[PDB]
């Protein structure tokens, strides 16, 4: 047999959720992004313990607007505070459009999937989170 892939449900800790909203709305309509720090345990649980934001650009998301130099410094900042675990993916915020990956975003995602196959992309809509529903 091969490897079988099966359901997962992404559990967004209360901390993680506020940060994405705060960073994403504030930077809208310019695209916002950041990495998700967390851990995978189980085979049905992606647990995102924390997120942070990586520096915005007016080229929005790009494969080279991810910026690993900044990722590396940030990782060492969590390491000294004893909070580093495993980066479980990336999130990005589309402005007022729906949740769907753009063609460019597919290739951004293809990169993180090499590094860890369990990586997700979490697409956020902040201007639509001012309903009684949060759209993510």
């Amino acid at each position: 047999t091969g490897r079988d892939d099966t359901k997962e449900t992404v559990y967004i800790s209360s901390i993680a959720l506020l940060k994405m909203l705060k960073h994403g709305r504030a930077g809208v309509p310019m695209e916002v992004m950041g990495l998700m720090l967390g851990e995978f345990v189980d085979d049905y649980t992606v647990n995102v313990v924390d997120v942070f934001a990586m520096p915005q650009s007016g080229t929005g998301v790009s494969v080279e607007a991810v910026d690993d130099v900044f990722q590396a410094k940030m990782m060492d900042m969590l390491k000294q505070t004893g909070r580093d675990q495993m980066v479980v993916g990336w999130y990005h915020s589309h402005p007022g459009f729906g949740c769907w990956l753009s063609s460019v975003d597919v290739n951004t995602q293809k990169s993180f999937e090499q590094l860890n196959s369990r990586a997700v992309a979490v697409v956020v809509d902040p201007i639509q989170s001012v309903k009684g529903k949060v759209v993510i």
Binding site: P55, Q56, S57, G58, T59, A65
Partner: protein, 60 residues
């Protein structure tokens, strides 16, 4: 060097001139501390402009 030569044999003793350069050794050990202090700050400053301008060219 308008001093510590045969001008200054007249003004004060030749032994004052022996020791005087050796009080200028303390004095340049201090000016060297301050000059190297200023080497480290100009090395950090220039790299702090690099950090700024890198975002700025992306937006530009």
């Amino acid at each position: 060097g308008d001093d510590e030569l045969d001008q200054e044999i007249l003004n004060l003793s030749t032994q004052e001139l022996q020791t005087r350069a050796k009080l200028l050794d303390n004095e340049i050990r201090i000016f060297r501390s301050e000059l190297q202090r200023l080497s480290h700050e100009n090395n950090v400053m220039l790299e702090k402009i690099k950090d700024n301008k890198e975002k700025i060219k992306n937006n530009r």
